[PDB]
Short mmCIF file of N, CA and C in Angstrom, two decimals:
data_model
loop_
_atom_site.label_atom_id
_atom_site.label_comp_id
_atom_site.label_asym_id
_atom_site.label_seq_id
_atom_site.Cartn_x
_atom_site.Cartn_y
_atom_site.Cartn_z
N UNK A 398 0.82 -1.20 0.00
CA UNK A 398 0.00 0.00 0.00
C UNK A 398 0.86 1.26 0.00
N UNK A 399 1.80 1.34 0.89
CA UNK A 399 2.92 2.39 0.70
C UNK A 399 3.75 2.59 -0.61
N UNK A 400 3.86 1.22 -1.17
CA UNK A 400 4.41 1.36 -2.52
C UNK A 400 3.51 1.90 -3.70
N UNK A 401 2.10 2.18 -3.25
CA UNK A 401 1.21 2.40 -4.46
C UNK A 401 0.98 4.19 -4.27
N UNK A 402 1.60 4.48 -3.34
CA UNK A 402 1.21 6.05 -3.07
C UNK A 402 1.98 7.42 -3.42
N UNK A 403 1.56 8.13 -4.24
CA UNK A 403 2.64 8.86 -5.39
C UNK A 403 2.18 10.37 -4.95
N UNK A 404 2.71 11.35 -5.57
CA UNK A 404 2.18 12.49 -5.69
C UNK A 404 1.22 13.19 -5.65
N UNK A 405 0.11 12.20 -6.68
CA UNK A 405 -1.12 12.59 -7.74
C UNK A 405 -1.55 11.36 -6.30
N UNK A 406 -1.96 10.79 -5.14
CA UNK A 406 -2.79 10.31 -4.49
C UNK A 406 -2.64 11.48 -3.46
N UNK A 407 -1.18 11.67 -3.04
CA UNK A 407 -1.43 12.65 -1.78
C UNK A 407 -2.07 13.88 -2.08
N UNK A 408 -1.62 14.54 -3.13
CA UNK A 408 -2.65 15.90 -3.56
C UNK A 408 -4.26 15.57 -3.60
N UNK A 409 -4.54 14.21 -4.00
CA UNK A 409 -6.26 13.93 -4.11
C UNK A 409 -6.42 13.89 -2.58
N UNK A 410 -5.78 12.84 -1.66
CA UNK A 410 -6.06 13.23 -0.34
C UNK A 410 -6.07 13.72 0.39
N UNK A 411 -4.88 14.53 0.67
CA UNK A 411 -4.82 15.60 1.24
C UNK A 411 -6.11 16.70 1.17
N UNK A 412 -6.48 16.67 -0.01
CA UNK A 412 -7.33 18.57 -0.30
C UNK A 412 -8.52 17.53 -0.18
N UNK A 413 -8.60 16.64 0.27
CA UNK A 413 -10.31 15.77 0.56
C UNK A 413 -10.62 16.16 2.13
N UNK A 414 -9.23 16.17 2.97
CA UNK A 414 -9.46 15.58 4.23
C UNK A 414 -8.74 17.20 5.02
N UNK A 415 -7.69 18.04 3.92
CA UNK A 415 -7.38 19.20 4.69
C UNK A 415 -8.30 20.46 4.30
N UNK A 416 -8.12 20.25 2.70
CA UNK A 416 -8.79 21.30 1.59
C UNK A 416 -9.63 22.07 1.99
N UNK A 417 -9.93 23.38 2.55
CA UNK A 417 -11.82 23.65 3.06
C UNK A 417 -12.73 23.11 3.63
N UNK A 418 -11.60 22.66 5.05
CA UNK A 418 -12.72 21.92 6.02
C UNK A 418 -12.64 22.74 7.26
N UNK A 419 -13.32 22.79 7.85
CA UNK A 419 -13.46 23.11 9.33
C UNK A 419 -12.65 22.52 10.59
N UNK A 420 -11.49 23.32 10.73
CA UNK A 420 -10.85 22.73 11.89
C UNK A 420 -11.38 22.72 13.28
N UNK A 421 -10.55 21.66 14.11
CA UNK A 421 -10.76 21.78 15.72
C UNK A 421 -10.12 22.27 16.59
N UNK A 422 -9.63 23.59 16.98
CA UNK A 422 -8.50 24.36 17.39
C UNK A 422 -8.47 24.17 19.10
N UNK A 423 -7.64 23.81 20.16
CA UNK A 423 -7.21 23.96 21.25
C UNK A 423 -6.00 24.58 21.41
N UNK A 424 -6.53 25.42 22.59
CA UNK A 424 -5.29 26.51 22.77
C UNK A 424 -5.43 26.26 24.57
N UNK A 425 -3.98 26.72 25.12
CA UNK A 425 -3.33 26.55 26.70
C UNK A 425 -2.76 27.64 26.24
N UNK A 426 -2.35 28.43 27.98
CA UNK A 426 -1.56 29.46 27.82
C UNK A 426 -2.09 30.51 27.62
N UNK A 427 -0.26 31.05 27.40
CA UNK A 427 -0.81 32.53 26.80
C UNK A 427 -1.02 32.34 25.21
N UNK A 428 -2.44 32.66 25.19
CA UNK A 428 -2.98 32.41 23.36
C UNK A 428 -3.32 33.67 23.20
N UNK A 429 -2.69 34.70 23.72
CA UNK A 429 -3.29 36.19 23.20
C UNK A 429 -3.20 36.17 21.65
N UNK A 430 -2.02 35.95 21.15
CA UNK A 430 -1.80 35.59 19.79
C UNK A 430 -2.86 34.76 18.88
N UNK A 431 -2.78 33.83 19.67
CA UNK A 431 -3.60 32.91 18.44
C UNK A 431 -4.65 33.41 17.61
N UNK A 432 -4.69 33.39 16.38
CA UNK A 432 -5.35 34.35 15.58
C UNK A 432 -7.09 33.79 15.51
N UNK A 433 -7.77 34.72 15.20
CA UNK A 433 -9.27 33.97 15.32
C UNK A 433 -9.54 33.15 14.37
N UNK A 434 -10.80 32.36 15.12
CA UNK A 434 -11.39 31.29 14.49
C UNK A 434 -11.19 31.88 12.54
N UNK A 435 -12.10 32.50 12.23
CA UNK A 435 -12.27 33.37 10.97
C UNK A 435 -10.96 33.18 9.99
N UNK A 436 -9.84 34.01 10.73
CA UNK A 436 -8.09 33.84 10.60
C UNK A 436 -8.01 32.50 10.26
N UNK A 437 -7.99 31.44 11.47
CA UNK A 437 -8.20 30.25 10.87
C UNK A 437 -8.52 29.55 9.33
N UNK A 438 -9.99 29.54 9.98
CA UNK A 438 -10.53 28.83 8.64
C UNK A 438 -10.38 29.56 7.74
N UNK A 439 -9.91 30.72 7.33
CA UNK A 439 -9.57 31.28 6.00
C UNK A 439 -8.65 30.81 5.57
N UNK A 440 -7.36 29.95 6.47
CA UNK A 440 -6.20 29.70 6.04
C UNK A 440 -6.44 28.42 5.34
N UNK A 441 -7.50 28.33 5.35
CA UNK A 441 -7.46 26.35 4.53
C UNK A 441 -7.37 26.39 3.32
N UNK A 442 -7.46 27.56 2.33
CA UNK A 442 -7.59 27.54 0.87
C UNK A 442 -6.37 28.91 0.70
N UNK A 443 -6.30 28.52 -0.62
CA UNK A 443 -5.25 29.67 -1.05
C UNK A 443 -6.18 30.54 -2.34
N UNK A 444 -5.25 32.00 -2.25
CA UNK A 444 -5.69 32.86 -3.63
C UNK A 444 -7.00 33.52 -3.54
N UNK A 445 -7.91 33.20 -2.38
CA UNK A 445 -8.50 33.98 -1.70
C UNK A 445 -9.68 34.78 -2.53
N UNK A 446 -9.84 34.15 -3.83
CA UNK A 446 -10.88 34.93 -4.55
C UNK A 446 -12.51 33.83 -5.00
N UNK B 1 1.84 49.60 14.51
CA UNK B 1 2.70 50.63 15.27
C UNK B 1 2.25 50.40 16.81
N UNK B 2 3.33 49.97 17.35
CA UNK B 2 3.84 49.33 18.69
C UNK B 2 2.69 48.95 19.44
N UNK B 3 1.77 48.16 19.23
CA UNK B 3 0.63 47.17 19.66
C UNK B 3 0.32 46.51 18.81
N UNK B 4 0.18 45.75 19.48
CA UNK B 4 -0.52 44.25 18.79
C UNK B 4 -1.03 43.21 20.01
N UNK B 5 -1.35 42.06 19.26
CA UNK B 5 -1.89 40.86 20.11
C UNK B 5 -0.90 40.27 20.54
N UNK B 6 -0.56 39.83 22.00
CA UNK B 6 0.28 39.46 22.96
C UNK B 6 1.14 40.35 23.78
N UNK B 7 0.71 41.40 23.69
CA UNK B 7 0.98 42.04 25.24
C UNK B 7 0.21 42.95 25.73
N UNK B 8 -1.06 42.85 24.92
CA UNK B 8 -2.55 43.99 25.47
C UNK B 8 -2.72 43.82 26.90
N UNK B 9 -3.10 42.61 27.03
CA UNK B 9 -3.25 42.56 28.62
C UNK B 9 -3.13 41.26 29.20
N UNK B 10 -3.32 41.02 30.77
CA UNK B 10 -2.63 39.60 30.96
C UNK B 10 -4.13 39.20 31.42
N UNK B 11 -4.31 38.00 30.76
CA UNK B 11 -5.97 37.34 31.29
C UNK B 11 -5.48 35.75 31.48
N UNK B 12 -6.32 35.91 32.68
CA UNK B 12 -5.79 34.84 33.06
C UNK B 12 -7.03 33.72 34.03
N UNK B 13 -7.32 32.25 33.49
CA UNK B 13 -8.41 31.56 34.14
C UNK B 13 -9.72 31.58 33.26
N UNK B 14 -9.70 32.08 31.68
CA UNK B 14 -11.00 32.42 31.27
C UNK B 14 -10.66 31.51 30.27
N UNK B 15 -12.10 30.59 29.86
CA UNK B 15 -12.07 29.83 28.53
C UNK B 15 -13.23 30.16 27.74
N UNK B 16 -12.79 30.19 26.67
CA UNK B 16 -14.23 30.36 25.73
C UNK B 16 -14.33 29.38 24.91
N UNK B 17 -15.46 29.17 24.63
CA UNK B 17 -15.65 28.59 23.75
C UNK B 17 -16.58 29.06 21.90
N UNK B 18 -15.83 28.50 21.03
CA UNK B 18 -16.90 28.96 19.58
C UNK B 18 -17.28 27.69 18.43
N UNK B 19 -18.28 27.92 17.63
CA UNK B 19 -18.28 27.51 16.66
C UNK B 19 -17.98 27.91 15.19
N UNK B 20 -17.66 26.62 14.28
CA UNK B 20 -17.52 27.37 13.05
C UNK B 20 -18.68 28.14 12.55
N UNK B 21 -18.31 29.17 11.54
CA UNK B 21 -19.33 29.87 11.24
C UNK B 21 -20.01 29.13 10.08
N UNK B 22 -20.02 28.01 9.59
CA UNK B 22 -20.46 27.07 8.71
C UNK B 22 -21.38 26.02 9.52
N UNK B 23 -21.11 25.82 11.21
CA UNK B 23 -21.76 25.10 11.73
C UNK B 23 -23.08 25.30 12.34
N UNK B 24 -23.38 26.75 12.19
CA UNK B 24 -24.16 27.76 12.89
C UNK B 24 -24.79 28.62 12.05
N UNK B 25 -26.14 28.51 12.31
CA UNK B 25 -27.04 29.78 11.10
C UNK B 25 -26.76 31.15 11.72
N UNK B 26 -26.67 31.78 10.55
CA UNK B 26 -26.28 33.17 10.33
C UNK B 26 -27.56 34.07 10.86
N UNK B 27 -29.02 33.84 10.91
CA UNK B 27 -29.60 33.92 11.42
C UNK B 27 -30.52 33.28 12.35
N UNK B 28 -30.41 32.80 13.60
CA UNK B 28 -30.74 32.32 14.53
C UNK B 28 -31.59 33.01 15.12
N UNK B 29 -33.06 32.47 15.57
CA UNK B 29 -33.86 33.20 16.59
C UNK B 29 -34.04 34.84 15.87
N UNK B 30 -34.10 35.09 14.58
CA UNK B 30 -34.18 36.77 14.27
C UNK B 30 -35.28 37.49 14.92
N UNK B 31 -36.76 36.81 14.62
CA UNK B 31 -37.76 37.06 14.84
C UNK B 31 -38.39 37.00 16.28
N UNK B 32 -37.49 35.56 16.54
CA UNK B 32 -38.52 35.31 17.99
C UNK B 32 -37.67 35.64 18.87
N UNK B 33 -36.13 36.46 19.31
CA UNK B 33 -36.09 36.99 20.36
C UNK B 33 -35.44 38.47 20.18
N UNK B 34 -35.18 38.72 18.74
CA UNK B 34 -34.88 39.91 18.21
C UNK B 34 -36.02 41.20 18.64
N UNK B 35 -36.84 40.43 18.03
CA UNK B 35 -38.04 41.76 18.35
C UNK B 35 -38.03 42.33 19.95
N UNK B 36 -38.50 41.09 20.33
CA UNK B 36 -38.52 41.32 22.14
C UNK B 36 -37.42 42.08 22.36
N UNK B 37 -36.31 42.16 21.50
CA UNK B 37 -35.31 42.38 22.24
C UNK B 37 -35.00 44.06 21.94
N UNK B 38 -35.45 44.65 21.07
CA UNK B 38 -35.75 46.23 20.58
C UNK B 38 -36.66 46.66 21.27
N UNK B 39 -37.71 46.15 21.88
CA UNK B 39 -38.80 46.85 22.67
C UNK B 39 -37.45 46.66 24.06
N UNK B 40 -37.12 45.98 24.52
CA UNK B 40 -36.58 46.37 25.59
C UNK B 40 -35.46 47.51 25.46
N UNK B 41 -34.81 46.82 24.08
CA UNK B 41 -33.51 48.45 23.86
C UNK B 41 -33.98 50.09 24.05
N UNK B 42 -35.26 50.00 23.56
CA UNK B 42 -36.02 51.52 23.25
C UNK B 42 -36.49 51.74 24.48
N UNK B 43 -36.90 50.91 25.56
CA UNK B 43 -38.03 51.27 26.54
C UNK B 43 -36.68 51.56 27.24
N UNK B 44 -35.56 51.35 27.51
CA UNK B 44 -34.32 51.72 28.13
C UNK B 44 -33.95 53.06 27.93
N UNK B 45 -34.50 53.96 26.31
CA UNK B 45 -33.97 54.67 25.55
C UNK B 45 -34.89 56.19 25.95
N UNK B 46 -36.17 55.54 25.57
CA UNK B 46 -37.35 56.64 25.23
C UNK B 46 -37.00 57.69 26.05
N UNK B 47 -36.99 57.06 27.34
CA UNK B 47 -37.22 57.94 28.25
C UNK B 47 -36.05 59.02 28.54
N UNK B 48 -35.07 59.13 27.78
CA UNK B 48 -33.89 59.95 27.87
C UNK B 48 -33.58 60.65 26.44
N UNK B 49 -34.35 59.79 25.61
CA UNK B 49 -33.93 60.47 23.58
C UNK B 49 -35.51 61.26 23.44
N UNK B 50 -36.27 60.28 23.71
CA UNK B 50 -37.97 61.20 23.54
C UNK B 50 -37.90 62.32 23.74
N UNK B 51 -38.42 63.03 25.29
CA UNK B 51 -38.35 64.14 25.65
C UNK B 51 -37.81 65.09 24.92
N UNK B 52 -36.41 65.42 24.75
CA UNK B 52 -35.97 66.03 23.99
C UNK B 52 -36.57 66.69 22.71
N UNK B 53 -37.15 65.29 21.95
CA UNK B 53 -37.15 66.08 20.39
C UNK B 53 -38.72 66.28 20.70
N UNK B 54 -39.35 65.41 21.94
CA UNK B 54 -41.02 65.62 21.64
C UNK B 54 -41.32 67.52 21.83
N UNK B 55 -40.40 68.00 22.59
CA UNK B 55 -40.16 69.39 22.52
C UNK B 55 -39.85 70.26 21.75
N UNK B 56 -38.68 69.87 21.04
CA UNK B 56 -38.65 70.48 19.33
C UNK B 56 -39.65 70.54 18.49
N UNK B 57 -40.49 69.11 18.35
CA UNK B 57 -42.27 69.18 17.34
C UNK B 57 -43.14 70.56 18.24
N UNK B 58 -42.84 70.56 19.63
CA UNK B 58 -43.88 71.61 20.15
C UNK B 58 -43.19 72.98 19.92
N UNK B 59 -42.09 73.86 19.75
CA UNK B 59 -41.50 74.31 19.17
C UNK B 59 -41.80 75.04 17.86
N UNK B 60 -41.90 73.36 17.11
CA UNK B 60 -42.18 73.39 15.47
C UNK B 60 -43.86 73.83 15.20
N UNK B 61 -44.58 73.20 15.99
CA UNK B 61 -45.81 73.46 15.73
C UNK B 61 -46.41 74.73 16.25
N UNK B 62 -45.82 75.19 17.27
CA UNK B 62 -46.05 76.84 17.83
C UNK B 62 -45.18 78.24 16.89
N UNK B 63 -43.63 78.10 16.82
CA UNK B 63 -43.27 79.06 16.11
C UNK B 63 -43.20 79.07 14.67
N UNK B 64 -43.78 78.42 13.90
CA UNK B 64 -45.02 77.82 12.79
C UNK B 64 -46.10 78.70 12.90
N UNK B 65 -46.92 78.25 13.91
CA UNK B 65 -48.40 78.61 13.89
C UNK B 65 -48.19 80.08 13.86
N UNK B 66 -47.11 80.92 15.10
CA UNK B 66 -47.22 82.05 15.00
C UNK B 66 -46.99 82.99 13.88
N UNK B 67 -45.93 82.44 13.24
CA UNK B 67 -45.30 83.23 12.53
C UNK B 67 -46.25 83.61 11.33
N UNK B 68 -47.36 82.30 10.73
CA UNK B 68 -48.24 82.91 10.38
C UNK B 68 -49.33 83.77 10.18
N UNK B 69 -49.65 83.61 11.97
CA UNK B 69 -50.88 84.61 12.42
C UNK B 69 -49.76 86.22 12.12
N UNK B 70 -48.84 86.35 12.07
CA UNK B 70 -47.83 87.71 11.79
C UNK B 70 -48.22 88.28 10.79
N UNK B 71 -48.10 87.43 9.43
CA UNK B 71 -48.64 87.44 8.23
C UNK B 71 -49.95 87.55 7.79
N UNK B 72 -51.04 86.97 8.94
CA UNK B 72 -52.34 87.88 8.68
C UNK B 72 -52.67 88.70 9.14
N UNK B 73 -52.93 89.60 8.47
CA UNK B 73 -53.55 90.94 8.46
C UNK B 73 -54.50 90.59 10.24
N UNK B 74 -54.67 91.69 10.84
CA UNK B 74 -55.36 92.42 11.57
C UNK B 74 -56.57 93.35 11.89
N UNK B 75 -57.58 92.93 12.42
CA UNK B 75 -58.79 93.98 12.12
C UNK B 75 -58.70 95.43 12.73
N UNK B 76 -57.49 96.00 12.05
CA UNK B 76 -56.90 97.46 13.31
C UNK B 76 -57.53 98.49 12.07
N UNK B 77 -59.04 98.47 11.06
CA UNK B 77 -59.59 99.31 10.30
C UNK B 77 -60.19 100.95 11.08
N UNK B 78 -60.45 100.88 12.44
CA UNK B 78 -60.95 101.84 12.86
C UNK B 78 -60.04 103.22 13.42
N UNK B 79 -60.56 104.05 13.65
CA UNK B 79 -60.36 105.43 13.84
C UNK B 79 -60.18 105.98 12.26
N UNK B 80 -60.41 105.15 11.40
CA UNK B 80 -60.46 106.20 10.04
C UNK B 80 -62.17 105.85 9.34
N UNK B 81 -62.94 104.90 9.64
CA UNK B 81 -64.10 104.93 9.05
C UNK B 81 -64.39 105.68 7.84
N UNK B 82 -65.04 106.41 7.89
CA UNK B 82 -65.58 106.63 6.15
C UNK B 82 -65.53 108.13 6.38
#
């Protein structure tokens, strides 16, 4: 199964399972930083138009 | 220019919690606790914004009224009769 997995599978899987989905964010600490939810989920796609 | 997020202030013991904005309607409850919820904003309000202008309409409707009675003529015809 590892030998069957190329380029052209991780790009199909990856953008299935990372691509424009809704993350689950936990934060400890000091998270003054951590940028908002919004910030977030905007970061899942690129080019923004 | 010299602020930003992580040294505004120190908070400390508070958790929040959110949802995605995909998981959650954009309008929730508009009708059924929105409304209720403007009669209470205004009945908080009236009583400090009202007054005010209900005085300006009395104002409007008196130095109005007068300024016309100015403009009509007067029955001041006598001491010259005929």
């Amino acid at each position: 199964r590892i030998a069957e997995v190329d380029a052209r599978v991780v790009r199909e899987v990856c953008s299935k399972y990372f691509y424009d989905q809704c993350p689950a964010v936990a934060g400890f600490g000091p998270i003054e930083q951590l940028p908002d939810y919004n910030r977030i989920r905007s970061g899942m796609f690129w080019l923004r138009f | 220019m010299g602020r930003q997020f992580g040294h505004l202030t120190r908070v400390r013991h508070v958790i929040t919690y959110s949802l995605s904005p995909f998981e959650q309607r954009a309008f929730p409850h508009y009708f059924s606790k929105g409304i209720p919820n403007v009669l209470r904003r205004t009945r908080a309000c009236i009583l400090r914004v009202a007054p005010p202008f209900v005085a300006f309409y009395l104002v409007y409707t008196w130095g109005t009224q007068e300024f016309e009675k100015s403009k009509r003529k007067n029955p001041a015809a006598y001491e010259n009769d005929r």
